Amino acid sequence: KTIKVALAGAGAFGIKHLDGIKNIDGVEVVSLVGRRFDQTKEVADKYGIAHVATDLAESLALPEVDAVILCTPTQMHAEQAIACMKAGKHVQVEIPLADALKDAQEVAELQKQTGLVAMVGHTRRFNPSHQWVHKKIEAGEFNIQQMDVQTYFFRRTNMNALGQARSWTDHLLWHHAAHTVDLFAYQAGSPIVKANAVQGPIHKDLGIAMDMSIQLKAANGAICTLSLSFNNDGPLGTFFRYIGDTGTYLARYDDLYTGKDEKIDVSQVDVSMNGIELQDREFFAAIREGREPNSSVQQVFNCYKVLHDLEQQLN
Amino acid sequence: KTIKVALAGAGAFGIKHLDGIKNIDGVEVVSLVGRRFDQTKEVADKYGIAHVATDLAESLALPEVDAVILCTPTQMHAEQAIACMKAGKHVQVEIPLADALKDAQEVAELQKQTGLVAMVGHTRRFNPSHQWVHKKIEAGEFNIQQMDVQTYFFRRTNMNALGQARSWTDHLLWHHAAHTVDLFAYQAGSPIVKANAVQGPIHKDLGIAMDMSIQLKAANGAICTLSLSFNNDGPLGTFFRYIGDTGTYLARYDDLYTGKDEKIDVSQVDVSMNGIELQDREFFAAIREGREPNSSVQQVFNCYKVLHDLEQQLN
Numbered sequence: 001k002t003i004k005v006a007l008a009g010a011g012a013f014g015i016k017h018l019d020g021i022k023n024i025d026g027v028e029v030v031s032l033v034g035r036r037f038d039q040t041k042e043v044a045d046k047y048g049i050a051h052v053a054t055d056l057a058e059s060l061a062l063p064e065v066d067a068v069i070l071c072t073p074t075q076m077h078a079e080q081a082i083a084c085m086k087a088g089k090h091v092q093v094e095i096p097l098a099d100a101l102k103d104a105q106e107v108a109e110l111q112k113q114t115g116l117v118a119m120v121g122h123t124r125r126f127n128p129s130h131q132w133v134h135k136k137i138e139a140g141e142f143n144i145q146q147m148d149v150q151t152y153f154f155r156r157t158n159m160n161a162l163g164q165a166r167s168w169t170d171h172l173l174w175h176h177a178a179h180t181v182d183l184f185a186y187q188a189g190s191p192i193v194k195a196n197a198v199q200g201p202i203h204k205d206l207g208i209a210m211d212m213s214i215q216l217k218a219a220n221g222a223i224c225t226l227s228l229s230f231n232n233d234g235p236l237g238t239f240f241r242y243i244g245d246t247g248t249y250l251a252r253y254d255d256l257y258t259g260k261d262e263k264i265d266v267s268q269v270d271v272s273m274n275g276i277e278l279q280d281r282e283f284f285a286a287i288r289e290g291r292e293p294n295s296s297v298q299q300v301f302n303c304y305k306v307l308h309d310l311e312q313q314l315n
Numbered sequence: 316k317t318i319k320v321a322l323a324g325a326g327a328f329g330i331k332h333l334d335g336i337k338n339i340d341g342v343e344v345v346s347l348v349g350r351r352f353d354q355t356k357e358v359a360d361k362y363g364i365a366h367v368a369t370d371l372a373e374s375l376a377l378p379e380v381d382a383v384i385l386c387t388p389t390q391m392h393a394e395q396a397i398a399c400m401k402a403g404k405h406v407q408v409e410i411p412l413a414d415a416l417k418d419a420q421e422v423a424e425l426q427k428q429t430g431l432v433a434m435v436g437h438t439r440r441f442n443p444s445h446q447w448v449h450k451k452i453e454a455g456e457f458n459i460q461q462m463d464v465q466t467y468f469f470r471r472t473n474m475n476a477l478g479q480a481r482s483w484t485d486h487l488l489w490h491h492a493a494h495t496v497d498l499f500a501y502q503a504g505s506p507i508v509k510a511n512a513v514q515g516p517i518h519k520d521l522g523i524a525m526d527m528s529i530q531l532k533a534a535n536g537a538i539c540t541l542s543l544s545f546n547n548d549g550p551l552g553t554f555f556r557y558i559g560d561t562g563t564y565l566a567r568y569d570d571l572y573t574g575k576d577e578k579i580d581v582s583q584v585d586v587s588m589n590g591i592e593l594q595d596r597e598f599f600a601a602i603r604e605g606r607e608p609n610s611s612v613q614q615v616f617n618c619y620k621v622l623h624d625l626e627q628q629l630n
């Protein structure tokens with residue numbers, strides 16, 4: 001049976017999901033939700049999506065919709081995920097699951113009560129380059145001693161990754177550090193037992209910190225260093241360095257390199273080189289098979305606990 | 316008057332000082348100290364140094380010797396600096412001033428009692444690339460928001476930067492973090508008021524930490540992130556990222572780049588492109604002029620206090 005999907009938020013990431021979903025057999029997006037009808041309709045027509053709404057509830061009232069993908073602004077995710085599960089729909093939520101621990105806990109509790117698939121978009125789990133390193137670790141061929149990570153944008157304005165203006169404000173802690181806090185514990189195969197952060201001054205017009213530094217230690221002794229900035233005038237995005245016992249690796253999105261700039265071939269690891277498509281394939285596989293997805297709300301939640309502890313430190 | 320110098324420690328760095336000193340008028344190295352007479356004699360003959368000793372005291376007993384440069388192993392620096400000042404000789408000590416706060420305090424107290432020039436080799440103050448950034452800051456054209464730093468070696472054995480085996484064991488904190496701990500406060504123009512570190516496991520055969528993560532915050536709100544490793548199988552050394560209000564800069568030894576990898580011309584900043592030579596020029600200028608040097612024991616000592624606080628944290 002074709003799984004019918006509502007997609008909420010036709011921004012840059014919602015577009016990346018729609019483009020990925022075109023490659024996944026037996027899934028169809030039947031409803032598109034976005035803040036402005038005319039702009040939403042233009043996207044729906046480009047993608048052939050029949051239903052267009054300005055409220056998520058309108059798509060939740062459709063009985064045929066089986067699943068929801070949330071690419072809305074972060075501040076809406078937990079409430080909307082809760083609403084989806086109250087309507088009986090599986091839900092995938094873009095990272096972060098929430099910007100508060102309480103709301104992430106409320107989402108986890110409703111998922112536990114419903115037994116529905118609720119997934120968080122920790123795409124780093126699904127990028128082929130990180131999967132390659134992960135598979136070497138599971139094989140016992142590699143152990144992480146230190147991860148050194150830079151998450152940098154030039155974002156003194158409320159802009160997305162394509163340089164377009166946002167109507168909402170982003171956050172260094174809940175959205176960007178979340179990728180690394182989760183991914184470090186995942187790749188180390190060991191829980192985080194120490195975390196320290198420091199932040200710079202709050203920006204007068206955006207109300208968020210523009211610079212942040214995070215340090216993690218896993219119970220097995222692996223450490224991670226993370227630098228975050230919205231002030232970086234250079235190449236935007238995340239660069240990851242794995243320093244291990246048997247090697248060094250540099251991950252740059254879906255690309256992997258040795259510490260000597262030798263590019264490693266990851267095109268063989270998974271059926272797609274697109275991590276967003278692999279994330280959605282895992283989500284829909286879990287729905288069809290009645291299993292938990294990789295990056296379930298349950299799997300990623302200790303990340304949000306660490307983020308809360310860092311936030312309390314920063315205040 | 317020619318300033319006569321004793322150099323202690325014909326290692327990789329002692330040779331680099333000798334090559335620099337060859338370009339400094341009115342300075343002459345008359346004594347060379349090293350652990351094995353024949354190897355020290357071979358270097359002395361290559362550089363035309365007449366006196367060869369295996370003990371520093373032999374060079375300190377020479378009445379003609381005016382100054383000492385200490386490029387010995389770190390464990391010896393503080394004691395030897397004290398010996399220099401007790402014999403009435405000016406001294407420059409390679410970084411670190413000491414691997415313990417107590418010994419650094421003893422060197423500072425003897426410097427204060429004697430009023431002799433005692434300098435520490437914080438070469439980052441004198442590299443043309445860092446001087447360029449410092450001068451932009453002094454002009455009020457640039458303010459640091461974040462510094463992101465990687466200090467990496469592949470050093471599972473007691474080897475110097477040329478890959479030759481050392482007879483002594485190195486240390487991530489006191490020797491390597493010291494460059495950045497000092498350089499951050501110096502370039503930020505603001506004292507460090509918060510520091511946090513975590514480290515990996517102690518190495519069975521060397522007895523030292525192989526990985527370390529340090530985070531600093533200055534009183535003005537600027538932050539620093541520092542990753543250190545002896546496990547990095549890649550390009551060895553230090554890479555610096557300055558993220559400021561007006562720009563982004565990448566320092567790689569004496570080279571400087573923008574955040575877009577455009578190389579900046581630093582040949583206009585100072586009379587030499589060799590930071591070690593400029594360090595010695597500053598040392599000899601301060602002796603000749605009867606002034607305090609840049610990177611004096613007094614200027615850098617708060618760095619060693621920060622290092623002590625970090626070691627207490629790690630324990």
Ligand SMILES: NC(=O)c1ccc[n+]([C@@H]2O[C@H](COP(=O)([O-])OP(=O)(O)OC[C@H]3O[C@@H](n4cnc5c(N)ncnc54)[C@H](OP(=O)(O)O)[C@@H]3O)[C@@H](O)[C@H]2O)c1
Pocket residue numbers: 008009010011012013014033034035036039054056071072073074075094095096121122123160161165166167175
């Ligand atoms: N690595 C990853 O997996 C990854 C990457 C990027 C983003 N994300 C997450 O994805 C989310 C969105 O990111 P983005 O960069 O796509 O954002 P974006 O381009 O700024 O906008 C997302 C869309 O949500 C829409 N929207 C606003 N209010 C809405 C409402 N009430 N109902 C429905 N839609 C509404 C916006 O419409 P208007 O702007 O026209 O009002 C926009 O088109 C964020 O939470 C982000 O953290 C994850």
Ligand SMILES: NC(=O)c1ccc[n+]([C@@H]2O[C@H](COP(=O)([O-])OP(=O)(O)OC[C@H]3O[C@@H](n4cnc5c(N)ncnc54)[C@H](OP(=O)(O)O)[C@@H]3O)[C@@H](O)[C@H]2O)c1
Pocket residue numbers: 323324325326327328329348349350351369370371386387388389409410411436438475476480481482483490
């Ligand atoms: N950025 C900088 O300015 C910078 C950079 C790197 C290091 N340094 C510091 O500079 C110092 C030396 O570094 P390196 O790489 O040159 O060290 P190195 O190559 O390991 O050795 C320095 C020399 O000292 C000699 N030595 C040993 N015992 C001695 C003794 N009792 N009396 C006299 N000489 C003796 C060693 O001889 P054997 O090998 O025969 O013992 C060696 O030839 C270290 O403290 C290091 O931290 C500064």
